[PDB]
A paper describes a structure:
We present the first atomic-resolution crystal structure of a multimeric ring form of a viral dsDNA packaging motor, the ATPase of the asccφ28 phage, and characterize its atomic-level dynamics via long timescale molecular dynamics simulations. In contrast, a close homolog of the φ29 ATPase from the related bacteriophage asccφ28 (gp11) has been shown to form highly soluble functional rings; extensive analytical ultracentrifugation and small-angle X-ray scattering experiments show that the ATPase forms pentameric rings in solution. Individual subunits within the ring are organized into two globular domains connected by a linker domain, each of which is nearly identical to the corresponding domains of the φ29 gp16. Like φ29 gp16, the N-terminal domain adopts the canonical ASCE ATPase fold, while the C-terminal domain is a ‘vestigial nuclease domain’.
Two crystal forms of gp11 were obtained: (i) tetragonal crystals belonging to space group P43212 and (ii) trigonal crystals belonging to space group P3221. While the three structures described here were determined in the absence of nucleotide, the active sites of ASCE ATPases are well characterized and can be accurately identified. Two distinct conformations of the Walker A motif are apparent in our crystal structures. One conformation binds either a SO42− or PO43− ion in the canonical β-phosphate position. The ion forms hydrogen bonds with the backbone of the Walker A motif in lieu of a β-phosphate, typically provided by ATP or ADP, which explains why the Walker A backbone adopts a conformation similar to a typical nucleotide-bound ATPase configuration. However, because the structure was solved in absence of nucleotide or nucleotide analog, it lacks any interactions mediated by the α- and γ-phosphates, ribose sugar, or adenosine base. Thus, this structure likely represents a conformation with mixed characteristics from both the apo and nucleotide-bound configurations. However, the crystal structure of asccφ28 gp11 ring reported here shows no such helicity in the N- or C-terminal domains. We suspect that we do not observe helicity in the crystal structures due to lack of substrate DNA imparting helicity.
Author numbering:
A (entry chain D): 5 to 372
B (entry chain E), E (entry chain C): 5 to 368
C (entry chain A): 5 to 371
D (entry chain B): 5 to 370
């Protein structure tokens, strides 16, 4: 009867950055979008719908982004008779006895001849920042985490999290009131979005529906297990095929938690990042080698470890500059080892710091 | 038209899921559609026409999906004068003295400005939200089994039957009254659709027109070879070309029956699927190897056989997770061996269980 | 000119299937279309314009299919003032003092809000047969034989003739009055269309303008030698360039006649097709091998030669089934030898029987 | 005298085919178009603007093809007040006290709701109906010769000149009053257009402003040196970059002159083309071989030299049939040697005849 | 807050070529565009917005190129009530009591049915020069220098500066009053634009906000350190990610200064460019070779060293022509060595001369 998930709890807290994970088919996009229409229609505000890849937007049904059922549930009795024409891709409806119309053209949705929704893709939006969106209060990131099942080969954009942040500034031109919604159908570690936020996924946090951080709040949406009527043939048929049943809870199936271990010796190499020094230490073992990733706040006790510097300004003394060509030779193999859970991190905090560094420089990795 | 086959017998039985096989050119889709207009017009209900490949829908002439002949035979004495305009894809007709219009625009057909028929393709079925299709009582899947002659290379969607079920669930939002029609011009084993239903095609079931199961009914429609008027040149020309003539009776030409043999020895590997354990056992022979595919209800007697688990959550203890990248290597040859009839299956029931597993994970 | 060729002679004979070859620029498409308008306009009948490849239809000018010059020549004095609007793809004209309008949208042409012409492509026609073209009296297959000059690489559909035959049956359901027009700018052997008809192209048949078979008629159009006004500079320039001049007579340049020889020995393999047995025999010669393609009506004297069966139902006993993966292994090299004029055929009738078999099972080109 | 080029001199001669080369920035297209309007407006005549590649037309601004300035210079005081609407591409002006409007929509420009200018691309030329163009008196081919600078990689259409001739015949239907204009910003040998015309570019012809041939006239337009005002900052900045300055006189920089030498010995192979026999003769030299391309009218003295025939119909007697797929292997290396200036040609007449043969069958594959 | 940068100072000086570097987020394009409207509306003048790649223009929002705020800040009280319709991209407003409308369709913006702004891409600009813009006073090049971080793969157009210069002459035909603006978010050496202008970037010039050349003036805008509101979550998040924070001051982070050294010995090869001869000299060293790029005013003392000449017309006698195939064999490796700072340059002036040569003939 009532929509399972609502964005209200997230809106009530002070934080303005919300991350919603799991519960695909629950209409997260339906409810997040649904809440805003109240604002978009009469507060002279617009919304930007963000997708990672430009291909995803072209396939998206823009005529159905705002649907009659959506208007009817959020406005209810206030919503009047609705007489849309699908050939012309125009919707006419009346609210409060006042006529309004929605028409979807190109990548924009128009309400009473005013643009309320912008459809832009991160792969294309990043390439031009001269664009300017005058009034935007809501940015929504849908399917923000890659799902291997839906898409066999999908690669996160290069230095993705930084590209997104720069896009925020262009969309949000020093606006006090701005909201960001990130919606993921599946949640797992080792993505750049988690690295940027700094959130580390753990089963305990999954058990607790709500987790609180300083900058953002992440809420976990789990679709209630419903007694399935076995008199219905379609329900029985879905039950016989297990691959169908398992799809519902696949979101939190695997979180890709990484290994943790402590190693006393000093790293083979150091790289200075974020007023910090990252080091990798190798321990020789009979079968091969064992790799340990560490973070050092200071260089005390590490006189002779070579230091690589990514940034030109911060370089000083003997540290060697790190160029695009150089970082591949030294760190290509180390990055591949990082992506897979083949390495030991001293603590979860160090894993986040390393994630920020790795996902900034990750590139290509196609057929390698 | 509707003379040979009617869906009325299927509607008369209790089951709500129907599989119709064979009898191409008999207007199966015409009559399933034909019966439903009765509801679509006046019971405030709609229908969805489902095709596997988006190409099948784009090329389909949607304005003629509902034709005057159809309207006239199903409404009969009620049907009045009919004045259609083809340019705007509008039909004007009166039933019971009430004027109505059917307009087809884009992938939807409207009856009195209400959508009664939706045209959607299974390849695109993903990213279709339930709000787009409010009221649907009928889903019709046409040409559900691949035909080798019509299309040279056509591949069932990866994990297709699961894709279909999600489409069922999205379209049918806990609706008690829902009907599924699966219409196939040709019937043969080794497709995912038969596997999903759990139906195994056999000549005995083909001779008996109707087979009932717990969830569905499958009815086989075969048109008897009709005397061809040899005065018409087009008919005369078709007779001279044999590949065309054999196409008429192509539906049940080959049912792809698979080999069956039993091997006592224990399997080489185990993979846990569907609350069960599937194993492949190899018997060495002078020329090479002989393959036996088995199903184990339980692990009794199989202490140390390695177990691969498709699902991460259910995995436990010594079972090693099987991810898609690591999976290809192990089961590539076994999947090739399954698709080509090169392995021995213990029984048809195990063959069906293996079909579910294979077609869920198949990749070309 | 438009008055050069007329389909009238073809219509006068009883046969309903016509194959027109050669004479590029003679307006075969213009006149075949021209004859029908009387029917399309006033007999509540429609026409289907069929092309092999979807590329041919998308590039085709939908608006210019029916032109003012066309309407005027076939209707003449009956044709009234003509006031077309080029922007919106609309034509308004009056016939017998009655106003009519022709509009072209997407792949259809409409006359008085009724669809008279359908544009559909054979490559896409196979995917869907449930479509309903309600009333069709005319089906036109244009540029039915591939010309390498116009199109460097063009591939016939796999099992093409059956795709076409299925399309005939889908378009023409229950119609006593139906006409098929096949129009080729160039005529040559070794195409699947000729194989399906059973017609074998020969220089003698080209000399006689008209040939009659049981099912169809083939008429050969050769453009009469025309006096070239030298005085015109553009005419003088075209003469200097031979590739331009040779294009005019390109239709019958090469008819791809195949070699014929008889070999007594029995074949290496047999394949059963059309209640007959086709065989290939190899004769070893010092330089290499010599291939002979034969047809046997019966198995008498061929006890132990292996027999391949294309169709599963008819297969029996010692015959080994021929699957798609199998025929490529056995017959890929033999099919290559057939396409290139490298084998000896016993007679033209066996060549046709072999052509039907090859083009039914032919491998899809690599790409 | 008159620093501004006009097509009047070209129009005065009898010939109807004109090739204009060089002088980029002189407004060749501006004046060729400009001269015709009197006919287009009041003689019920249309013009066709032809470009090799569709890309050139799509980027082209069709509205400004006919501009107010163009109208004023040719019509002058006779031209009245002009109040055009740029949004809808509708211009408003009166001539001789009669109001007129020119509206540009899609690939056509309409004058008083009548089409006077057609914009069509040679790449897209296929499947255009002759009837579509009832009356066309002017065909203008702009940038007809490829310029290496404008486009890093640019390819002439396969068998282009034959493609052009088919398009000429379709547009023109025994029209006595028909004109062909070919405007090229750069002139050089070894293109199919020169091969088709039969024109061989030579510096003497460039020094002589005007050249007449049987079918056409070629006029060379050279823009005078204009003392460049240094006061403009843009001009001084251009001076520092030399690659920019040389572009103005780039047209006649390189004419691709081919080597000429005569060789007495008889050829190695013969191929029959155009009722003629082409031959390639090789002279052995210490470093390698020397190639001489010759043309023979008759086979006298050439008894046993093999003859290849491209066309099956004309084939006869001892000639061995050569098919398009087989033809390339035999002549691939010889064709490569022709395109790069590495062979000796008997005369310019033979060089053109070889060009016609090569450009008809030259093909690239991968 | 307040526009950190305004174009008025640049407009005040005589020179007509301005190069603006750095200060991302300052609305350089916002203020340059804003200043011109006074001219575009009432001086019967137009403007051309230049982007390197056509991809950059298609993604650009033509309706938001001119925004109500920009209108409001530059005209202020003069601006009246504004009620635009975004559906058709038509704005209506009144200035000085006179009603006007600007409608943006395709790649053009029209003011009172007159085109004031043209959107063209440099990659496509070459192929069509016949296009004639009757009145153009402003040409603006935005993001003129490539930024490696924002765009993964970005190529300077081959011979870009000449392509731009040819475009200048076509757009500006005999116009005395013309202004060119070049706005770059990042400033670094080794781009063709700096080479074409002849400006050599140096940190000393970065400290001084304004640098004056003869042909042009270049102004450097660095966005002053502003206290970041740490109540805003987005600002708090950016501080944690260092790569994001550096982006604002990334412009002048690295200028790619090249090494400079003089070598007396004569070069291996000479290439004549701009009535001068560039030479590369190799000194054999144990690890490998050391490359020195030099400029010679005359050939005295270099009688027999090979000379490559780029232009055929100027080529004469012993000079060897430099063709597309020939320039790949000799100079492919030398160009790779130039792009990376692996070579020694005699002076900064010679480096610019080598830059003119390299970026004119470089191929990717």
């Amino acid at each position: 009867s009532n929509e399972f998930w609502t964005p209200k709890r997230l809106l009530e807290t002070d934080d303005r950055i919300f991350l919603v994970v799991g519960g695909r088919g629950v209409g997260k996009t339906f409810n997040v979008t649904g809440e805003a229409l109240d604002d978009l229609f009469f507060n002279n505000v617009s919304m930007v719908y963000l997708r990672r890849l430009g291909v995803e937007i072209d396939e998206l049904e823009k005529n159905n982004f705002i649907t009659e059922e959506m208007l009817r549930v959020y406005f209810g009795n206030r919503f009047s008779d609705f007489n849309a024409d699908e050939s012309k891709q125009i919707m006419r409806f009346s609210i409060d006895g006042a006529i309004h119309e929605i028409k979807a053209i190109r990548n924009k949705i128009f309400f009473d001849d005013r643009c309320i929704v912008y459809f832009i893709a991160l792969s294309r939006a990043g390439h031009v920042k001269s664009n300017n969106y005058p009034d935007v209060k809501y940015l929504v990131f849908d399917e923000v985490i890659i799902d291997r099942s839906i898409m066999p080969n999908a690669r996160y954009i290069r230095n993705e999290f930084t590209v997104l942040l720069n896009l925020i500034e262009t969309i949000k031109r020093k606006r006090e009131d701005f909201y960001l919604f990130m919606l993921s159908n599946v949640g797992e570690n080792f993505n750049p979005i988690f690295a940027g936020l700094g959130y580390y996924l753990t089963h305990e946090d999954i058990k607790k529906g709500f987790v609180k951080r300083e900058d953002y709040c992440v809420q976990f949406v789990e679709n209630k297990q419903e007694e399935l009527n076995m008199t219905d043939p379609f329900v029985r048929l879905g039950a016989k095929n297990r691959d169908f049943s398992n799809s519902k809870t696949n979101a939190f199936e695997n979180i890709r938690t990484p290994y943790f271990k402590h190693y006393g010796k000093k790293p083979k190499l150091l790289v200075k990042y974020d007023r910090q020094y990252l080091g990798i230490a190798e321990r020789k073992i009979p079968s091969g080698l064992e790799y340990y990733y560490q973070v050092y706040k200071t260089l005390d006790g590490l006189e002779n470890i070579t230091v690589f510097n990514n940034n030109f300004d911060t370089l000083m003394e003997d540290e060697v500059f790190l160029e695009e060509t150089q970082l591949k030779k030294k760190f290509k193999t180390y990055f591949e080892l990082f992506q897979q859970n083949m390495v030991y991190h001293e603590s979860p905090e160090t894993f986040l710091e390393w994630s920020k560094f790795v996902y900034a420089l990750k590139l290509e990795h196609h057929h390698h």
